[PDB]
Amino acid sequence: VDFHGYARSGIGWTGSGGEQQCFQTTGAQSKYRLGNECETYAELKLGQEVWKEGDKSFYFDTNVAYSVAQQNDWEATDPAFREANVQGKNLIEWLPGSTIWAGKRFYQRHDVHMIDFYYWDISGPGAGLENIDVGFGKLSLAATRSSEAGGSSSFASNNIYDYTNETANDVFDVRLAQMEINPGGTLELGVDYGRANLRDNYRLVDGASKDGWLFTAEHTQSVLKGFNKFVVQYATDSMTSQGKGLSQGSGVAFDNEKFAYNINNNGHMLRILDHGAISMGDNWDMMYVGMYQDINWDNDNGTKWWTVGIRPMYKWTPIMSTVMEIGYDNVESQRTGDKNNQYKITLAQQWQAGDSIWSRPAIRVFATYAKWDEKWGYDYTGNADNNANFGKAVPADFNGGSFGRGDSDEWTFGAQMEIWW
Amino acid sequence: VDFHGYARSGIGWTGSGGEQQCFQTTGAQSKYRLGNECETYAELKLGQEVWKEGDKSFYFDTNVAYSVAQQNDWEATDPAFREANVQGKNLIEWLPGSTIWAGKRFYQRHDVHMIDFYYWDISGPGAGLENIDVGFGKLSLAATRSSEAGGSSSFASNNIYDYTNETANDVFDVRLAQMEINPGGTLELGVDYGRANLRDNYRLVDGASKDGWLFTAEHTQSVLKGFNKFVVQYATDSMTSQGKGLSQGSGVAFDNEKFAYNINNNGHMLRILDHGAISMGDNWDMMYVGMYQDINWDNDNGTKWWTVGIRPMYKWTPIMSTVMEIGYDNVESQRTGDKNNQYKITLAQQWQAGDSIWSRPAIRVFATYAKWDEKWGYDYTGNADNNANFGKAVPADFNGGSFGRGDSDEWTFGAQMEIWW
Amino acid sequence: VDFHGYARSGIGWTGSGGEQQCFQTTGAQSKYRLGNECETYAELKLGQEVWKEGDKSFYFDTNVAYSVAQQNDWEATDPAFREANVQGKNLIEWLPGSTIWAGKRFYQRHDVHMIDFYYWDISGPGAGLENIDVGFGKLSLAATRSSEAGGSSSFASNNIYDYTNETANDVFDVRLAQMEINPGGTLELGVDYGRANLRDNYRLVDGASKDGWLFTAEHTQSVLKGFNKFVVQYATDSMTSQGKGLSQGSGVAFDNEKFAYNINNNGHMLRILDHGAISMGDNWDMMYVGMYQDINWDNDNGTKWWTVGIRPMYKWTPIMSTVMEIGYDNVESQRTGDKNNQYKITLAQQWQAGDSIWSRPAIRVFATYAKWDEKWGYDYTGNADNNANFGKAVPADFNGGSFGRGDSDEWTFGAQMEIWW
Ligand SMILES: OC[C@H]1O[C@@](CO)(O[C@H]2O[C@H](CO)[C@@H](O)[C@H](O)[C@H]2O)[C@@H](O)[C@@H]1O
Ligand SMILES: OC[C@H]1O[C@@](CO)(O[C@H]2O[C@H](CO)[C@@H](O)[C@H](O)[C@H]2O)[C@@H](O)[C@@H]1O
Ligand SMILES: OC[C@H]1O[C@@](CO)(O[C@H]2O[C@H](CO)[C@@H](O)[C@H](O)[C@H]2O)[C@@H](O)[C@@H]1O
Ligand SMILES: [Mg+2]
Ligand SMILES: [Mg+2]
Ligand SMILES: [Mg+2]
Ligand SMILES: [Mg+2]
């Protein structure tokens, strides 16, 4: 039995009092994670190669995930059963090296570690034919499923409160990877087509996006004992709200009282991203990100987000290091033109298993400082039935209220482990 | 650590739109499973032989089961903790080869794979003394527990709404197996006695079945590189509603609003079943079932169910096959005499680990067609307080309503893995 | 992968009817467990040494716990994710042999097996530096976290119903162990300081304990092939309600309707405990406890509890034994001066893996008799809003009601396994 997974767990304090607090910019889809993670999260994977004859094999893999508040010993939770799939490798003679698979799977996910941000993730229930050797690269085909909680009506209606039936969304994914385009440099291209897939006689609200595309281009360059990844993605309509390869064609969301409201996602997203991790000598490693993400919707409630950060690591010893993370977010509301910004600074002393910035496990002792200035926020007051602005970006002081996190400061400290195995 | 279990997971589409739909006859207790399974289901077993001295050993076994809708990646659920037991083998010198056990256990279950139907299952919390060598066969004794959600009142009452206290049911099970009765043929006999087991001063509703028996006879014949099982079972009163060896003596059920209603199970069940799996040459395997099950209740709301189906497999290659499944159900309401029927046809291309129809894992690509014609259904409209017919079989058009699945067609397709290890 | 854990599971009957019932004295914090455990409880631990170079290593450990009613096969539950931590051993050159750790962990827990009673348990999310070699002993430092469900208000208020915000409690723990003080005798000393840790501008109710101390002294003596532990603990204010090393500074509790009520824990607790397990020849083992615990609160609602019990084991054979357990509880309400008492007698035939009273797994067949006489109980009628006495000790016949378990008898029997591996 193969035992693999991911986990993080710790204990933290907020400088002004109480348990650790974590700092994310209103409107940003990520935060700089170092010394800024407020939950115990674990994935326990049990897998096995259950049959092997020569070059041919079947591999079975599972994944059970737990997320708890880490404020107590006994923390009862609903585990998420995320993966259960079988991979059949080298079973098709005319397509040597290629894998056939079906089941729930984390399918070739692309992320930026330091902000824990997945930018290409179509994971879910699915099936496909992977790694077809096409001479100048590897071709992979897959179909995966996601579902919105409501969005569909069984009868013709102009009332959005009738659109409460779950709507399956399908994604069809084609990727062509490992194209050697320059010395030490590979290129990967992907296309995703996603669409709401309605039951017979069901309908989406008038104007629903329904379907959409996501186009990806990723260049990977071997540099300074590490790598650089330069990414450009462009998404359309139904693919803009999740933004990582899953479709949300219904354009319907629900408040806490189960009232439906319209979040039409017609429009486009442009994401330009560069990240990597490099070594400078034998004492220094560094991770870095810079990203510009523009989500432009027809309803005007999109966002324009810039991020940049660095995470240098100084190795005193093969297992002991000093790690620092500096991260900056700036988010502009499309609706109001206001801007939200934050800069976060973390200092950590770390013991890790190996001398790389990728080495895990790691035990950290840290101190974090964040300073933010938010001039807008989302209006989630009342409910969607009472409030016509429910879910719209709004200036910080709209109607005498307070929206967004204001203009303030805070520091946290504590200890944490992180591991993948 | 031994890692074992069962899992199935896939992605599917309904021809008229939306996610895969699965087809079961109203009134039947099973469906033809090939290309007709609409959830991700997994049992993860971790066990260990924790002590061994010579012939003597203790084995520890567990089982955590997950069932999710396979419509999304993150699917939070309540896992069922189904097994946790210790088996002590060869500990009693005067009963060589026998096992003593206690804990929650899947105890000698008998099922028909292709319709995923358990016909002899008393699994639950329990204890027993298994495999006593009695010369001409093996004798096993066990006691297991189940519990109805309500059914018991703490005081004398004529109001069925007072019978809301959980009622434990005990089953006492004696089996005599492995009797060689003919060349290549074994016989197994079993008796189950089950009864509601009331707390001091609690009561069942007047007329409650209370207790009941289940008698089983199974003949196993080695034929054509596989087997044939011919089964006859007869159950009485409290053993008829579950019908696999667990008792439900209280005869009380609850609607969604927690209103109690009477489902007295006085009466009998006769089940005549034949199933097996045979090989025809080196290229053909086949599974087959035929069953007749008559549940005759004093209240007239029983059923009379006929099933038959076959699942031939053509082996093109040692790992690649074409599998087809054809299944037919016919259910007659005891109450009205109407009939519900369905025929399902599935075609699949499959890659599996081995050249048997029992070989797992298996990756399937399938297409399923079902056609049904239902003239009756159960009335679950209103609640048990408003509706005197709550839970009764009822003609399809009763009182201008629509009951059962009507007279229609549908086709589905998709991909799926199944594995036991 | 290392597979470790704890589990118990069985089936039982109550002499007067229905499923097994378990017997605990009102006011006691424990019960004599043999033949007196009414649930299936399991901890499944998966761990791994993920990196090792010479003397240095990192160990990763997890723990998922399940507790179900063992009344049915399919028992869906919320597993508790109790442990997820990394232990870095021998990483600090100037502190040889010491371990640095962070994550959720069962930290050096001290319990009395036979009454399943933890007397020193600060487990939870935490971090620390363990086993510092200090010449004449081992020094350990740790900080762990716990949280009360409510207790904090965001604004100044005299209304206890406003104090509904969770309040983090921190515990700082220092232990000095393994001091050889006499031949075959070790001494361990510990100090815990715990305090409610309020968010900025939040408050506790007027008079809240807020913080407190727990002082522990444990002497361990090697005797008669086993051991004797003699324990003295003294706790103050916020450390008295949980009583094992976790703080509950807020002094606020909630009824079932979410009404807050005051359980101020100002006062002190004195615990004097002696327990051990000894061998008498080759045929006899015995576990025993004696404890006096006095919880003296300023509000008068504390308790004074005496327990004593013994568990002799007669070994007929290396794997087969006859086990008996006799246990007595006596609890006096501080408020009324009434006394609750119970004596429990259990007889079991057992098969176990090894010839010790500590050997597991064990398969038991038992009969239990309990006789109790309770002259007081806690008033949990109405809710905290209607009832001024909510939660107070009260004479058995207070206001014509019935409080406590009365004056009665009962016997149970069944089978059970228990294992740790
Ligand atoms: O698939 C990535 C996706 O998973 C989520 C949970 O829905 O994040 C969790 O899982 C990740 C590993 O699979 C971790 O990186 C992350 O810390 C954890 O919360 C989404 O947030 C993420 O986009
Ligand atoms: O004990 C069989 C019994 O389990 C149920 C769930 O209550 O079926 C689940 O478990 C079986 C394996 O233990 C699978 O065959 C089945 O697919 C799964 O749903 C009952 O349906 C069944 O009678
Ligand atoms: O840490 C001990 C603490 O855990 C509890 C559950 O909250 O007990 C459970 O876990 C123990 C093992 O970790 C078992 O000994 C016990 O039987 C089980 O209920 C608390 O009751 C106990 O104080
Ligand atoms: Mg402005
Ligand atoms: Mg008719
Ligand atoms: Mg739940
Ligand atoms: Mg009195």
- Angle (CA) A332-A336-A337 rounded to 5° is 40
Resolution in A: 2.4
CB-based contact A130:B418 (threshold 8 Å): no
C-beta B66 within 6 A of ligand 2: no
* Among B9, B354, B421, beta carbon nearest to A48: B421
Residues in CB range of C94: below 8 A, 6 or more apart: none
* Among C1, C320, C361, beta carbon nearest to B60: C361
Breaks (C-N over 2.5 A) in chain B follow: none
Which residue of C lies nearest to B195 if distances are taken between CA atoms?
C18
Cα separation, B80 vs A377, in Å, equals: 42
Q: Is A62 exposed, middle or buried (0-12, 13-18, 19+ CB in 10 A)?
A: buried
Q: How many CA atoms lie within 13 A of B98 on its CB side?
A: 20
Q: CB A103 to CB B18 under 8 A?
A: no
Q: In the structure encoding, which two tokens stand for residue A334, read together?
A: 């499309």
Domain ranges of chain C: 1-421
Cα separation, A285 vs C264, in Å, equals: 53
- Angle (CA) A272-A275-A279 rounded to 5° is 160
Residues in CB range of C38: below 8 A, 6 or more apart: C12, C20, C21, C22, C70
Instruction: Examine residue A79 and say whether the peptide bond preceding it is cis (omega within 30 degrees of 0).
Output: no
Q: How many CA atoms lie within 13 A of B140 on its CB side?
A: 21
Cα separation, A94 vs A79, in Å, equals: 41
Residue A178, beta-bridge partner list? none
CB-based contact A289:A280 (threshold 8 Å): no
Q: What are the backbone angles phi and psi of residue B162, rounded to the nearest 5°? A: -85, -15
The contact set of B with C (CB < 8 A) is 1, 46, 48, 50-51, 56, 58, 60, 62, 64-65, 78-82, 84-86, 88, 91, 100-104, 123-127, 143-147, 166, 168, 170, 197-200, 202
Q: CB C145 to CB A78 under 8 A?
A: no
In Å, the largest CA–CA distance within chain C is 72
C-beta A116 within 6 A of ligand 1: yes
Residue B242 backbone class (left: φ over 0; alpha: ψ -120 to 50; beta: rest): alpha
The residue length of chain C stands at 421
Q: In the structure encoding, which two tokens stand for residue A276, read together?
A: 């990597």
Across A183-283, the runs of DSSP E, i.e. the strands, are 185-196, 211-223, 226-236, 252-254, 260-262, 267-280
CATH for B1-421? 2.40.170.10
Q: Chains that contact A by 3+ CB pairs under 8 Å?
A: B, C
Residue A90, beta-bridge partner list? none
**C116 Cα to the center of ligand 3, angstroms:** 8
Give the gap in angstroms from C-alpha C354 to the nearest C-alpha of chain A: 28
Q: In the structure encoding, which two tokens stand for residue C206, read together?
A: 């007027």
CB-based contact C330:C373 (threshold 8 Å): no
Residues lining ligand 3, judged by CB closer than 6 Å? Answer: A 74; C 6, 41, 43, 109, 116, 118, 121, 123
Ligand positioned closest to the Cα atom of A6 = 1
Question: CA dist B152 to B164, B202, B236, Å?
Answer: 6, 6, 21
Say which amino acid occupies A77: T
Give the gap in angstroms from C-alpha A144 to the nearest C-alpha of chain C: 28
Residue with the smallest CA separation from ligand 3 atom 9 is: C41
Give the determination technique.
Answer: X-ray
Q: What are the backbone angles phi and psi of residue A161, rounded to the nearest 5°? A: -75, -10
Q: CB C351 to CB B100 under 8 A?
A: yes
**C392 Cα to the center of ligand 7, angstroms:** 15
Q: CB C123 to CB A73 under 8 A?
A: yes
Mutational test site, ligand 2, from B24, B41, B82, max ligand atoms within 8 Å of CB: B41
Q: Cα B337 vs. chain centroid, distance in angstroms? A: 25
Q: CB A40 to CB C125 under 8 A?
A: yes
**A41 Cα to the center of ligand 1, angstroms:** 9
Residue with the smallest CA separation from ligand 1 atom 18 is: A41
**A405 Cα to the center of ligand 4, angstroms:** 14
CB-based contact A371:A409 (threshold 8 Å): yes
Cα separation, B117 vs B305, in Å, equals: 14
Instruction: Examine residue A395 and say whether the peptide bond preceding it is cis (omega within 30 degrees of 0).
Output: no
According to DSSP, the β-strands at C80-89 and C99-105 are: antiparallel
Q: Which of B282, B277, B363 is nearest to B320 (CA)?
A: B363
C-beta C3 within 6 A of ligand 2: no
Q: How many CA atoms lie within 13 A of A49 on its CB side?
A: 7
- Nearest ligand 3 atom to alpha carbon C39: 19
Q: Which long-range contacts (CB under 8 A, 24 or more apart) does B315-320 make?
A: B315/B282, B315/B283, B315/B284, B315/B285, B315/B355, B318/B354, B318/B355, B319/A56, B319/A91, B319/B351, B319/B352, B319/B353, B319/B354, B319/B355, B320/A91, B320/B349, B320/B350, B320/B351
Number of other CB atoms surrounding residue B78 within 10 Å: 14
Q: Which of C32, C41, C39 is nearest to C6 (CA)?
A: C41
CB-based contact C82:A73 (threshold 8 Å): yes
**C79 Cα to the center of ligand 6, angstroms:** 9
CB-based contact B242:B122 (threshold 8 Å): no
Residues in CB range of B183: below 8 A, 6 or more apart: none
Q: Cα B94 vs. chain centroid, distance in angstroms? A: 36
Give the gap in angstroms from C-alpha B256 to the nearest C-alpha of chain C: 18
Cα separation, A215 vs A173, in Å, equals: 10
Considering only CA atoms, give the Rg of chain C.
23
Cα separation, C213 vs C169, in Å, equals: 13
The contact set of C with A (CB < 8 A) is 1, 46, 48, 50-51, 56, 58, 60, 62, 64-65, 78-82, 84-86, 88, 91, 100-104, 123-127, 143-147, 166, 168, 170, 197-200, 202
Residue with the smallest CA separation from ligand 3 atom 22 is: C118
Q: What are the backbone angles phi and psi of residue B25, rounded to the nearest 5°? A: -70, 130
Q: CB A60 to CB B419 under 8 A?
A: yes
CB-based contact A352:C88 (threshold 8 Å): no
Across A70-164, the runs of DSSP E, i.e. the strands, are 80-89, 99-105, 110-112, 117-120, 124-133, 138-152
* Among C58, C125, C126, beta carbon nearest to A353: C58
Q: CB C70 to CB B125 under 8 A?
A: yes
Kindly provide the b/e burial profile for residues C161-175, where b requires at least 16 CB atoms within 10 angstroms of the residue's own CB.
ebbbbbbbbbbbbeb
Mutational test site, ligand 3, from C116, C119, C121, max ligand atoms within 8 Å of CB: C116
Q: Which of C411, C141, C110 is nearest to C273 (CA)?
A: C110
Cα separation, A414 vs B304, in Å, equals: 67
Residue B405 backbone class (left: φ over 0; alpha: ψ -120 to 50; beta: rest): alpha
- Nearest ligand 2 atom to alpha carbon B116: 15
Ligand positioned closest to the Cα atom of A398 = 4
CB-based contact A302:A322 (threshold 8 Å): no
